[PDB]
Design a protein around this ligand. Structure first.
Ligand SMILES: Nc1ncnc2c1ncn2[C@@H]1O[C@H](COP(=O)(O)OP(=O)(O)O)[C@@H](O)[C@H]1O
Ligand SMILES: Nc1ncnc2c1ncn2[C@@H]1O[C@H](COP(=O)(O)OP(=O)(O)O)[C@@H](O)[C@H]1O
Ligand code: ALF
Ligand code: ALF
Ligand SMILES: [Mg+2]
Ligand SMILES: [Mg+2]
Ligand SMILES: [Mg+2]
Lengths: 466, 460
């Protein structure tokens, strides 16, 4: 006999930790480190703070292979009333607002906590002080998995006599340092290369310390919350927008006020195409009217692009700088494309190419993938970026031979990155994004083609001297 | 200022449908089809019913590219009181018990419903008639994503005069038939090849109808609920086993009764290793004692394997038959390995190899992945199976040229397949599973080596 039951979100990820990027102790150790670093970065640069991040990993128990990961930052901290749910309630986040941040699910640190409880018995340790806080608040926490709620094992407070702000998080988990080492270092290095306004200190389980110095004191304009672009906004999103209204808007007012890229004239045209009365109260839209609006948004070809301003890009200068620093190529080029939209979300693709020099020889490019300023490391061959790179005919762009020295970099940034998994690491096959990654790659490949054509012309001239 | 909020499980998957295997209309059309087929199979062969499954896809709106997918089965149906939550509450399942079924998350059909709701306005339609039912119970449903609760648009019943028993589900979604066509047909074909006791009818949007007739009326022994194997059972799972006890067991009694592969002699050895009192009441285990138990389980080297009868395999004969039917090779061999355990879950790897004949020449093996009797189609290169196949040195097993005609098939079955995502198209990197996949592949590769050795000698 079939017996029907429900799960809490915590039970769901406890039963299936592989879904959150915790399938084995090597990947788990890596995942915990990056989840904490991403939280610390979102807590600093999103708020105009030059990040100073300290990461330590200690082997606590050799026989059991338990490691303690501690990440300390100079971020905005967390209000003490929010700490228990922030670290101990699955699907709880400050990043569900429409804004480019590394975090997005309200899952990552809880998944590390669940993994922690599944395999050892020490609670997670949080110390935090909000900006201008008179106290440093401390917590020891577990998750009641059935209830999906925090258990406060311990809480305290101490006088903040040094005016410190930020957060320390320490979590004890199974790990495999030897297997995870190269990917943890690659993660931090690739973060650092595109984040020169940050400083990192990293102490590993072998007691090695690496220092990654701040190279610039200029911080990018922090991304902020924005209204959706109408292209690809769906029926449920329309309902959300309507339900959130404090005013009794007409449909016309709703269009101009709740979206980017809609003025009076665009609103009039959308209303005409969708068969909607400008003056009807939007709270009264029917199910079928909502469909018509969503379809109209989808097929409308005259929308202005989203503002480049919901997003934070790496930028052509830095992309090129970083490719040169790491690979010492004969040639490098990059492009930061103009903003597009997919499913209501502004996005930008940036692309870079490096060729020759110290880049090793192979039969395929080295592909460097980033999403919202996070370097992607695992699962590359199923990423949509890899799909696009593989499908491009490099013979069209001057790559004559089967063996060559090329690096290709792609950064996607958006108010929402569509990952294939909650562990992130790879980007899903979304058609508008796929198309724009291709256009961007084609644009830099054209700069490569020019470089290779000039080299070829020189060679041809030299050939005549023979 | 940072504003902290919560999401319901419905809101989570509506915001991130890519996580459930709904990233674009082509994959979504495919995913909807397979989620429904897998639901129908779990409702039939798990209950000793020879599955009779009909799949129809109709293009209902050309301009908007909206398709209606209807799957009809002869399964056990759903109790009418359970239908609204079964189809309209995210994280609600009958497959949370420890048992080999295709389904596992309590999400799949709800994810299709969310995708349906995001893009069009017709509700999902369910008709169901459990065994002996004199009525067919009908529903139209939506999901209130904020509450994660069903919305009942219609609900009723008619007398069951034609003796329908089973379930019909129809759902309208955006799709891309031209792009999904080959993978949908591949999915049904590979399911049929390993499920000869099932009968399928497929009507596609172009009006093609394909019949896949039943070839045998002998169903495999249905998979049942089973006890965990102690190796890799975690601390939270120990707590659950303790909370579920209906008697005041000692730790010793706990070990013998609640786990596979622990007889009283093994229990004595574990209690000694873990430093636990045999006669202590298990409800009194401290946090630290649970840790020691779990570590002891992980390190104990003389556990017997779990019972093979826990799981439902394809079997060597059927694997080889299937390979021969698809590829017409010169050589085929297969192995159904003895059971292993990972994270407290029994699993079996089966592996097949085919060489030569009508297999095309290429630079790598054709790799056929299956998990809990489902053919995997997307994301092959990120799959742990692919990792093992790729990392194997085929030169050690007779493949000398860079070009060659080889098919490799791997089936993993378990009380739990660890997928990389809830879209269930690739298996995660779990080391016990990776190791056993390699071991199984090596075993069949040895048979290949033998074939290739004799073939090489004959060439002169
Ligand atoms: N180091 C930190 N500093 C400030 N806030 C943090 C920090 N770590 C976590 N948070 C807060 O806790 C919330 C939950 O964190 P997490 O589970 O990692 O989810 P996510 O980062 O995807 O939102 C975050 O949205 C953020 O508001
Ligand atoms: N065709 C059907 N026949 C019988 N039961 C079904 C059918 N479809 C769905 N169910 C039931 O509804 C539950 C929820 O289905 P689903 O969301 O697909 O989750 P899952 O299959 O992963 O458990 C299933 O666990 C099963 O009990
Ligand atoms: F912790 Al996250 F998306 F960054 F769940
Ligand atoms: F429908 Al499922 F796991 F099979 F959510
Ligand atoms: Mg996070
Ligand atoms: Mg299902
Ligand atoms: Mg199961």
């Amino acid at each position: 006999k079939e017996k029907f039951t429900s799960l809490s979100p915590a039970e769901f990820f406890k039963r299936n930790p592989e879904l959150a990027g915790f399938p084995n102790p090597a990947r788990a150790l890596y995942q915990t480190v990056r989840e904490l670093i991403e939280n610390s970065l979102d807590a600093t640069d999103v708020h105009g703070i030059l990040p100073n991040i300290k990461i330590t990993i200690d082997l606590i128990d050799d026989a059991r292979q338990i490691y303690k990961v501690n990440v300390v930052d100079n971020g905005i901290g967390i209000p003490p009333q929010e700490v228990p749910n922030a670290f101990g309630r699955v699907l709880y986040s400050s990043k569900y607002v429409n804004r480019q941040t590394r975090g997005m699910y309200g899952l990552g640190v809880k998944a590390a906590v669940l993994y922690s409880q599944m395999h050892q018995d020490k609670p997670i340790e949080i110390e935090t002080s909000p900006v201008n806080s008179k106290r440093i608040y401390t917590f020891k926490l577990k998750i009641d998995i059935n209830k999906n709620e925090p258990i406060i094992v311990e809480r305290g407070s101490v006088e903040n006599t040094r005016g410190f702000h930020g957060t320390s998080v320490a979590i004890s988990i199974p790990g495999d340092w030897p297997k995870a080492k190269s990917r943890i270092y690659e993660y931090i290095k690739r973060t650092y290369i595109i984040t020169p306004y940050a400083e990192f200190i990293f102490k590993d389980p072998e007691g090695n310390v690496t220092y990654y110095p701040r190279l610039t004191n200029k911080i990018p304009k922090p991304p902020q919350e924005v209204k959706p672009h109408p292209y690809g906004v769906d029926r449920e999103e329309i309902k959300i927008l309507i339900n959130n209204l404090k005013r009794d808007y007409t449909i016309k007012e709703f269009l101009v006020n709740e979206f980017q890229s809609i003025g009076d004239t665009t609103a009039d045209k959308i209303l005409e195409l969708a068969g909607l009365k400008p003056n009807k109260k939007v709270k009264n839209l029917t199910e079928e009217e909502i469909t018509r609006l969503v379809e109209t948004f989808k097929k409308y070809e005259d929308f202005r692009s989203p503002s480049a301003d919901s997003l934070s890009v790496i930028g052509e200068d830095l992309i090129e700088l970083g490719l040169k620093k790491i690979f010492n190529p004969d040639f490098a080029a990059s492009i930061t494309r103009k903003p597009k939209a997919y499913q209501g979300h502004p996005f930008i693709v940036e692309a870079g190419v490096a060729f020759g020099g110290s880049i090793p020889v192979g039969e395929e490019p080295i592909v460097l993938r980033y999403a919202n300023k996070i370097p992607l490391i695992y699962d590359e061959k199923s990423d949509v970026i890899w799909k696009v790179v593989e499908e491009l005919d490099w013979k069209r762009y001057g790559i004559e031979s089967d063996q060559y020295q090329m690096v290709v970099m792609v950064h996607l940034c958006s108010t929402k990155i569509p990952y294939k998994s909650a562990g992130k690491e790879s980007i899903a096959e979304v058609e508008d994004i796929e198309k724009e990654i291709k256009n961007a790659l084609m644009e830099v490949a054209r700069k490569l083609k020019q470089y290779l054509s000039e080299k070829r012309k020189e060679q041809e001239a030299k050939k005549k001297l023979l």
